[PDB]
């Protein structure tokens, strides 16, 4: 795998020299576990930035958080129950909340055994997830085993032994540094590595960017011996760690009694610790050095026992700091939010400005959605925070390489929710909406970004979470739209229709079709938006034989039928709206049709053509340019299209040609044009004809996608189109069982009179009609025929009476004829129509539900195509053509208010939004599943509160037996004496 | 294939946690553990009289 | 139940499994009817 291991890092032998390095990679212990640990054997005196820089990168480690290093001895007796407490409760559960690790003598058999009892334990216990780390520094020349960790090239599983001065490699552990010095089996001789890491930590930045904080480090002692007051003084004559001293030990209360203080030191070195040592500089030296500073040790309390240690650590930490780290940058570097929640509720210190001010730019970093609802909560105005400044460094940091880093290759609240939705993240991003001004609007954008952003990157872990956001945000604008259309319909009429300031001039409707949200046209208001929307200026739900009269007889719609100086303006209303220019369309269309087949019965002479071809003539030339201009001028952003504005014409191409219908009536136009100039060359007078009459069929066929706008026949045209994965399964059955049937007719029967269409005939497409109730039984049967032999070769012979049936047919086995027909016509009429019914209906029954659904996102764009078409009819499309050609969409796509009532109508949609949310989380809040997860809580919180209760009555009884007990004996001495 | 025996096993070990997990956390086994504390905490109150 | 807990925070079974101990597993054969009637042809 790798080998620039052995490159960089050297080791020494036997005043030494150096080498590269061996014995090195993953190590497996034959037991219950999820991963292999990692070694290296390493030399002393090398700089531990490449060894950081090894853990942190090659390996899979995370940067750490905290950094407590146990550091002590008590010799290998088992230790008193409290400190099995102790270490089972507060260096571990404090050590698996925030990310840190544990630096320990990573041996068998020392202190380290008790940490990694209380690892395994915590383990065993319960299952929370993020399981504990910790490293092991210890010196190559007491593991017990060598002889299977080295190998040149190093091995990547290695079996270990136990069983086959020493000691064996704890099996609890992830991290293995063998610091080697060069000797056999001295314990205790390697430090100045350890004190150089631990002092390498603590000068290098959290999180992503430089911006918070320095890591935080401590050294915590329990018991030692008389050598450890030394690596004391080291460390905190160095490099300023903070200390900690667990009390009750045996060689660090020495140290708590000389300063719990504010000659006695010979009484106090002789009598909390071993008493031969030798007062020479144990007095001066190892006392003295430690006492010139106390601002940096503290006292851990005795009396005070677990379940605060946390709290110890964080108040020694901060106070041992001013000899600018803070407590809530410090909280928010860790993920407990407890301790913010105390520090900010809490009453003592009244809190300032500029902590807060600081700290929410750290919070919005590291992605730590919790805390931003605290630290605005009760905080500052966002008006005070957002500087452009702040905002340029915000943008600044980017935390991937390939996504707005790529975008960029090439380079107040709305402006955090883009920063939100650009780097995915969606517990920030339904926060800043929540928060957000112009409701609507923005969540069919969100909708629309995501769905156009999901498709320039490449993996698909990122778009099974882009999908979800999407429509997480396109159900959350739904839900709003329908508590607001519960009351005023007119407020919620005119505010679907405006426009919004912030993304350029562009309305809600048009942001919901071009990111193609099925869900939002699915509901009912929008859909009778659109009806009114439909009826045009001024109609409201006249019945259809009024506007059949009225568009018959123009003197009607002056009068009282029609249902809304004056005329002029009336005469236009009514003309301009979308249900009138769809009915003349469809009545010149038709025209055209009554027309076309008189051209083809009657007409259509070997003559010069004459006025009522030259008609027609007229007629597809105009036919043929308002397709042009529907070409012309021009699709779906959720797909990946050029978009509006300005395209290509190798876009626009590309464009029209995919859509069945404009490909369908090209290819009827060039058909028809086929035909036209056959007919004007003599000599092929009868083709054109031929091609004429079957493009007459393309062109009424057509008469079916015209009527998809309607309502009564709109969800019904578009399921004929799925039904075609039955049909070609019904004609390859029949297909195959019918060539069979008709060749071993044909074969017994053996006409002797036979060419080639006579053959095929007889085979083909006489069976093809005998399953729609045409059985004719003369040419099968003889014995409805005449016996006649006229035929020479050896047999018997009879006369069809028919035609097309020779007139000879054989009458060898004439019953095996019959009762194949009998088979064929039980198999075709009755198994495969009744099976293709029950296929129909199967299928019907799953695809209604979705193309209904389909079939109402589109009917938007069915109508805004026809209000940018001419308003004249084809008779009268040169005169609108040359109104168009005289000088080279507005009604219901844009409401123009003032300001006074929009500024209210925002109030009136705010107020909606914010009764929705509180209904929707309160009734979470009293559901019937946290009622037991908060009885849960009350009943632990009132046992811990009955577990102070018990110890008072003993130590009670135990002081009312001692005052009685000297009662009695005042008593004795005072009247038995 | 060595590395691949590795990436399978950490799906399996993530797997069986994640089932366990979501069997700890139901709404049947609450009502059985806070039966089990108020059991506990009645027979430490039985100790007070 | 107990299985668990024996090799949980117990030994490495690189240590427990040998050969003898598996002959001696093997040895013991609980039923009379299934492995007993296909060992009888061994």
């Known amino acids: 795998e790798q080998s620039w291991i052995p490159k960089i890092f050297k080791k020494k032998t036997c005043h030494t020299t150096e080498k590269p390095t061996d014995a090195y990679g993953e190590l497996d212990f034959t037991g219950a576990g999820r991963k292999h640990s990692n070694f290296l054997r390493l030399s002393d005196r090398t700089d531990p930035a490449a060894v950081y820089s090894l853990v942190t990168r ?46 320990t003598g990573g041996l068998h058999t020392g202190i380290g055994r008790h940490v990694g009892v209380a690892v395994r334990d915590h383990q065993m216990a319960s299952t929370g997830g993020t399981k504990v780390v910790a490293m092991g520094v210890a010196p190559w020349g007491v593991v017990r085993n060598r002889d299977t960790l080295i190998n040149p090239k190093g091995s990547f599983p290695a079996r270990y032994r136990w069983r086959g001065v020493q000691f064996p490699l704890d099996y609890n552990y992830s991290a293995f540094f063998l610091v080697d010095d060069g000797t056999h089996g001295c314990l205790g001789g390697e430090n100045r590595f350890r004190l150089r890491l631990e002092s390498y930590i603590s000068q290098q930045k959290t999180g ?48 708590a009694e000389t300063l719990e203080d504010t000659r ?53 930490l901060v106070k041992a700091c001013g000899s600018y780290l803070d407590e809530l940058r410090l909280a928010v570097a860790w993920n407990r939010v407890d301790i913010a929640q105390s520090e900010l509720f809490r009453g003592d210190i009244q ?32 008006g005070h925070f957002l500087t452009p400044m702040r905002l340029a460094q915000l943008y600044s940091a980017a935390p991937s390489n390939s996504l707005i880093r790529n975008l960029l ?22 926060y800043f909406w929540e928060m957000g001004s112009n409701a609507v609007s923005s969540a069919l954008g969100a909708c629309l970004l995501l769905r156009v952003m999901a498709r320039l990157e490449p993996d698909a872990e990122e778009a099974a979470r882009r999908k979800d956001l999407a429509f997480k945000f396109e159900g959350m604008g739904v839900d709003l739209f329908g508590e607001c259309y519960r009351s005023s319909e007119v407020r919620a009429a005119r505010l679907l229709l405006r426009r919004c300031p912030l993304w350029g001039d562009a309305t809600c409707l048009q942001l919901a079709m071009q990111a193609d949200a099925r869900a939002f046209f699915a509901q009912d208001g929008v859909q009778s938006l659109l009806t ?86 007229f007629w597809a030339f105009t036919l043929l340019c308002e397709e042009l201009r529907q070409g012309l001028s021009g699709g779906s952003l959720a797909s990946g299209g050029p978009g509006p504005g300005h395209a290509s014409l190798s876009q626009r191409l590309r464009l029209y040609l ?74 390859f059955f029949l297909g195959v069982w019918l060539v069979a049937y008709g060749v071993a007719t044909e074969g017994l029967l053996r006409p002797r009179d036979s060419d080639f269409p006579s053959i095929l005939r007889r085979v083909f497409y006489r069976p093809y009609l005998q399953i729609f109730g045409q059985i004719p039984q003369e040419d099968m049967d003889v014995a409805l025929m005449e016996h006649s032999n006229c035929s020479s070769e050896p047999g018997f012979w009879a006369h069809p009476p028919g035609a097309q049936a020779g007139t000879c047919v054989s009458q060898y086995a004439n019953w095996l004829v019959v009762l194949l027909l009998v088979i064929f016509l039980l198999v075709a009429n009755i198994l495969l129509v009744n099976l293709l019914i029950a296929m129909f209906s199967y299928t019907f029954g799953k695809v209604q539900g979705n193309s209904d659904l389909y079939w109402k996102a589109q009917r938007y764009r069915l109508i805004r195509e026809f209000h940018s078409r001419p308003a004249l009819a084809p008779p009268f499309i040169v005169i609108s053509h040359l109104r168009l050609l005289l000088r080279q969409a507005l009604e219901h796509f844009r409401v123009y208010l003032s300001k006074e009532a929009e500024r209210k109508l925002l109030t009136w949609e705010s107020v909606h939004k914010e009764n929705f949310l509180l209904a929707r989380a309160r009734d979470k809040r009293e559901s019937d599943s946290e009622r037991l997860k908060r009885t849960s809580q009350k009943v632990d919180l009132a046992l811990k509160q009955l577990g102070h209760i018990r110890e008072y009555e003993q130590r009670l009884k135990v002081l009312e037996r001692e005052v009685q007990q000297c009662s009695r004996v005042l008593g004795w001495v005072a009247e038995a004496l």
């Open 532 to 617: 009114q929307k439909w009826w045009g200026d001024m109609a409201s739900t006249t019945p259809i034989w009024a506007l059949v009269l009225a568009f018959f007889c123009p003197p009607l719609i002056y009068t009282r039928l029609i249902t809304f100086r004056r005329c002029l303006r009336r005469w236009f209303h009514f003309w301009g709206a979308p249900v009138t220019i769809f009915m003349g369309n469809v009545v010149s269309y038709l025209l055209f049709l009554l027309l076309f087949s008189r051209v083809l019965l009657v007409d259509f002479q070997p003559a010069p053509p004459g006025s009522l071809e030259l008609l027609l003539y």
């Open 409 to 430: 290759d090439q380079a107040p609240w709305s402006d955090l929710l883009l920063w939100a939705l650009l780097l995915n993240r969606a517990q920030m991003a339904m």
């Open 351 to 382: 809190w300032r400005s500029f902590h807060l001010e600081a700290s929410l730019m750290d919070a919005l970093l590291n992605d730590r959605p919790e805390f931003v609802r605290l630290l605005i909560s009760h905080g500052l105005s966002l």
């Open 264 to 316: 006695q030191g010979e009484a106090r070195d002789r009598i909390r610790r071993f008493f031969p040592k030798g007062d020479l500089e144990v007095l001066q030296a190892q006392v003295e050095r430690i006492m010139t500073r106390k601002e940096l040790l503290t006292v851990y309390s005795s009396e005070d026992g677990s379940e605060e240690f946390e709290t110890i650590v964080l108040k020694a």
């Open 208 to 255: 992503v960017g430089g911006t918070g904080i320095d890591i935080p480090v401590l050294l915590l002692l329990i018991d030692g011996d008389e050598k450890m007051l030394t690596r004391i003084e080291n460390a905190t004559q160095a490099q300023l760690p903070c200390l900690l001293v667990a009390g009750s030990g045996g060689a660090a209360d020495c140290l």
């Open 658 to 731: 995919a859509d069945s219908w404009n490909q369908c009536d090209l290819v009827a136009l060039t058909c028809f044009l086929l035909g036209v100039g056959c007919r004007l060359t003599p000599g092929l007078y009868h083709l054109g004809r031929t091609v004429l009459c079957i493009d007459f069929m393309v062109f009424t066929v057509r008469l079916l996608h015209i009527f998809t706008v309607n309502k009564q026949l709109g969800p019904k045209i578009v399921i004929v189109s799925k039904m075609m994965k039955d049909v070609f399964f019904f004609l």
């Open 58 to 103: 090659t390996w899979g480690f995370r940067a750490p958080n905290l950094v407590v290093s146990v550091l002590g001895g008590s010799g290998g007796p088992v230790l008193q129950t409290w400190l099995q407490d102790l270490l089972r409760r507060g260096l571990v559960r404090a050590a698996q909340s925030t990310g840190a690790w544990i630096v």
